[PDB]
């Protein structure tokens, strides 16, 4: 994990030109830049060291990502702590977040097979977090804005600021009851991602009728009542084979079960998604 001088960062971002702002968030602004004389494009996050959670989140991200390597996780190339600043350098995910290709966007809708391959990629990333590091890593912030897409549409899990080792629509309701957090909490949030990919609507819409506010409650309700097909993304209607639809929906339903101990592991989710992709052929 390489250290960047603050002069290298500023050359990469052309002194943090708002020309290069890809997006802004709680941690800070993210800039599009290039390093190694322009051969490598990078995303550069500038935090504010006066925030302790900004600093905590910065430190968590470096201790986690410096030890992980996986095709479906955003790679941390390095950081810059000079001037006691907080700069993180990742490779650039050219197509942004999964959310911005699902709804409230004017990007075109994603074909069904591409949505499934994105979910499969994210599942492999989470599977690696749960089974491939020294100890289980609970991401704690799986959501459609923390799955990024590179220029060949490969899905990568990102934003490791809240993860631990050793967002409203997505929180495991068992955590406000059992007060213990498990990798099954990632499985719950991922089940919500799956329904978001199918339904192309936010996980939490506070303006709706009481039954529909929470996708994690609404979509299973609709399935049991035999009407999940009516709330699917209009672009996807008619495009999902019946056997793929049943397998995808049943997998998603199992993920958002009430008790974590009844939920499948990510390995089981991943295999069932790959099986759903085979049934779509
Ligand atoms: N590696 C990356 N490549 C390209 N864009 C990125 C990368 N990492 C983060 N971003 C952008 O930065 C934004 C800020 O992320 P975050 O602070 O979590 O806000 P949000 O949760 O609303 O996405 C993301 O929405 C995304 O568009
Ligand atoms: Mg994010």
Swiss-Prot record:
Residues 1-281 are cytoplasmic. It is found in: Cell membrane. Residues 16-276 form the Protein kinase domain. The active site is at 141 (proton acceptor). Disruption phenotype: Embryonic lethality due to impaired fertilization. The pollen tube fails to arrest and continues to grow inside the female gametophyte. Disturbed MLO7 relocalization to the filiform apparatus upon pollen tube arrival at the micropyle. Severe cell elongation defect in RNAi mutants with decreased FER expression. In fer-2 seedlings, altered responsiveness to brassinosteroids but increased ethylene response during the regulation of hypocotyl elongation. Increased resistance to powdery mildew (e.g. Golovinomyces orontii). Abscisic acid- (ABA)- hypersensitive response. Longer roots. Autophosphorylated. Induction: By brassinosteroids (BR). ATP binds at residues 22-30, 45. Expressed in leaves, buds, flowers, siliques, young ovules primordia, and young anthers with immature pollen, but not detected in mature pollen. Highest expression in the synergid cells of the female gametophyte. Belongs to the protein kinase superfamily. Ser/Thr protein kinase family. Interacts with ROPGEF1. Interacts with RALF1; triggering phosphorylation status and subsequent activation. Interacts with LRE and LLG1. Interacts, via its extracellular domain, with FERONIA at the synergid cell surface. Receptor-like protein kinase that mediates the female control of male gamete delivery during fertilization, including growth cessation of compatible pollen tubes ensuring a reproductive isolation barriers, by regulating MLO7 subcellular polarization upon pollen tube perception in the female gametophyte synergids. Required for cell elongation during vegetative growth, mostly in a brassinosteroids- (BR-) independent manner. Acts as an upstream regulator for the Rac/Rop-signaling pathway that controls ROS-mediated root hair development. Female paralog of ANXUR, a male factor expressed in pollen tube that controls release of the sperm cell. This is Receptor-like protein kinase FERONIA. It comes from Arabidopsis thaliana. The chain holds residues 521 to 815 of 895 of the full protein.
